[PDB]
Design an enzyme around this catalytic site. Structure first.
Site, PDB file in Angstrom:
ATOM      1  N   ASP A   1     -15.450 -27.565  93.133  1.00  0.00           N
ATOM      2  CA  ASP A   1     -14.511 -27.665  92.258  1.00  0.00           C
ATOM      3  C   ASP A   1     -15.047 -27.515  90.735  1.00  0.00           C
ATOM      4  O   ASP A   1     -16.002 -27.695  90.136  1.00  0.00           O
ATOM      5  CB  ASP A   1     -14.395 -29.204  92.287  1.00  0.00           C
ATOM      6  CG  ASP A   1     -13.043 -29.514  91.140  1.00  0.00           C
ATOM      7  OD1 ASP A   1     -13.187 -29.166  90.268  1.00  0.00           O
ATOM      8  OD2 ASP A   1     -12.341 -30.373  91.806  1.00  0.00           O
TER       9      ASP A   1
ATOM     10  N   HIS B   1      -4.323 -28.742  90.305  1.00  0.00           N
ATOM     11  CA  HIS B   1      -5.513 -28.144  90.229  1.00  0.00           C
ATOM     12  C   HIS B   1      -6.009 -27.395  91.477  1.00  0.00           C
ATOM     13  O   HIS B   1      -5.445 -27.990  92.265  1.00  0.00           O
ATOM     14  CB  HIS B   1      -6.279 -29.418  90.002  1.00  0.00           C
ATOM     15  CG  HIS B   1      -7.843 -28.869  89.946  1.00  0.00           C
ATOM     16  ND1 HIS B   1      -8.383 -27.939  89.119  1.00  0.00           N
ATOM     17  CD2 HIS B   1      -8.822 -29.599  90.441  1.00  0.00           C
ATOM     18  CE1 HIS B   1      -9.554 -27.876  89.079  1.00  0.00           C
ATOM     19  NE2 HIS B   1      -9.943 -28.519  90.050  1.00  0.00           N
TER      20      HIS B   1
ATOM     21  N   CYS C   1      -8.385 -22.370  87.290  1.00  0.00           N
ATOM     22  CA  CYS C   1      -8.916 -23.099  88.522  1.00  0.00           C
ATOM     23  C   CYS C   1      -8.598 -22.375  89.750  1.00  0.00           C
ATOM     24  O   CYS C   1      -9.343 -22.280  90.747  1.00  0.00           O
ATOM     25  CB  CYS C   1      -8.152 -24.458  88.524  1.00  0.00           C
ATOM     26  SG  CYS C   1      -6.422 -24.377  88.964  1.00  0.00           S
TER      27      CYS C   1
END
EC number: 3.4.22.-
Length: 226
Positions: free
Chosen positions: A132, A115, A185
């Site tokens: 995030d 991630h 991401c």
């Protein structure tokens, strides 16, 4: 920001993503060499790799200078992990030739497992924001980076940070656009970084990511942002 791509652009973009040798260096700068293999991580549904992210981060720095935006410092994608496992001493030299405190905005890409996320250090406000795309909170991460700042300051300026004036915040799922798949991401991190470094509210969404991916390949090829 949105935009409509031209045929000549979509052409060269299809060119770079399309088949060809993997080691063919397509763009070079900042001591980085983007190969066709690297640029292909920009193809839809692909995970961006370190080279692409670092390259794009460095482009934000130049874009800011030329356009009159806040002084920007971008840490390498390899910095945070080195700090987390080796402490300050392990990264003491990663800021050689620079005084972090003369900048206005410091971006720290966060790579954890598969991630990607982002930490923004705004020296103008003495604030650290954790961004995030999967709604995660980064209290510990900000805490570790704030301690890094104290060590950098005490080491390079022989002065302590005034901790009492610093604050940190994790942007909630409603404060910033979230990803709706398992491959963007790295793109959200890049676009968070792009908008944030221009003090522009983050109004983009997941829907626009496919266009951003195409735009970024052109931008990386020409070493210029749109």
């Amino acid at each position: 920001d949105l935009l409509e791509l031209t045929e000549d652009m979509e052409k060269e973009i299809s060119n770079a993503l399309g088949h060809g040798p993997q080691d063919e260096i397509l763009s070079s700068a900042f001591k980085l060499r983007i190969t066709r293999g690297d640029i292909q991580t920009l193809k839809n549904y692909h995970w961006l790799n370190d080279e692409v992210i670092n390259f794009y981060m460095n482009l934000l720095v130049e874009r800011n200078k030329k356009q009159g935006y806040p002084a920007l410092h971008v840490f390498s994608t390899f910095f945070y992990p080195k700090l987390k496992s080796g402490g300050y001493q392990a990264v003491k030299r990663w800021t050689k030739g620079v005084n972090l405190f003369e900048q206005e905005i410091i971006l720290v890409p966060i790579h954890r497992k598969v991630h990607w996320s982002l930490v923004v250090i705004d020296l103008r406000k003495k604030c650290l924001k954790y961004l995030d795309s999967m709604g995660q909170k980064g209290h510990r991460i900000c805490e570790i980076l704030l301690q890094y700042l104290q060590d950098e300051s005490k080491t390079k300026r022989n002065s302590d940070l005034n901790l009492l004036e610093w604050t940190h915040h994790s942007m909630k799922p409603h404060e910033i656009p979230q990803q709706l798949n398992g491959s963007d991401c790295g793109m959200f991190t890049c676009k968070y970084a792009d908008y944030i470094s221009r003090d522009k509210p983050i109004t983009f969404t997941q829907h626009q990511m496919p266009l951003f991916r195409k735009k970024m390949v052109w931008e990386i090829l020409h070493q210029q942002l749109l």
